[PDB]
Amino acid sequence: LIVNVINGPNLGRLGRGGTTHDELVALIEREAAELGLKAVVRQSDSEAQLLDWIHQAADAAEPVILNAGGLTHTSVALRDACAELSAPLIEVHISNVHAREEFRRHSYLSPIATGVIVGLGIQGYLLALRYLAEH
Template sequence: MTARILLLNGPNLNLLGTREPEVYGSESLADVEALVARAAGEFGLDVRAVQSNHEGALIDAIQEAREDCSGIILNPGAFTHTSIALRDALASVPIPAIEVHISNVHAREEFRHHSYISAVAAGLIVGCGVQGYELAVRRLAQLLAG
């Protein structure tokens, strides 16, 4: 059975490629999903991709990952800075999660400097553009290999 990772993208990430390209780049969400699938394939991993603008749908996806995923790559978008519920959902599943942000959130507005997610994530990648997702796959593969 092939190990699967959940690629979870939060609010407004469906607009990648058109939303503030000077901050988030010109790659689309489909480009990100293809990049992750390619990188995961190198390690024999399958990917289930979910994007939602709704906090509850993201929580549901995290809880469902308990059943069929070995790890999570998560860009929670703005929920990073506001959602204790997402943090608690991640803490409730016994699989590693890597938090990813396309932009360097620490070089942006002060409210973006705090993450509720980081404390329960196995790793954090910021400011590497969409390449951060590929780095997250590689790190998650290392964690899963033990």
């Protein structure tokens, strides 16, 4: 059981909460070890690169945890790539997106995702991992 953890634009800028992307990678590694699954963490500011990673996960029938960053609210292309996924897709936001600007309260990904976790910080990733471990 391999879970794909895909981070979109600006997410490599974490810390620089105060948890850096390197620290998040480490946290996911340990949680994956506890849950008895493999987790691959990827980050790109490139929409095309994210599309390719979804495509691979579609063909490999592997679960995806996706934090699309700003592309969440804007990209039909990313939504359409995600629609190919037969394994579960969990949308993740670190901050509570409904406490911010109104334009952030709409998502192209949410309707086609299995579930969404919002505002639970970095823990949102680990909780999504646990959902997939027990499903």
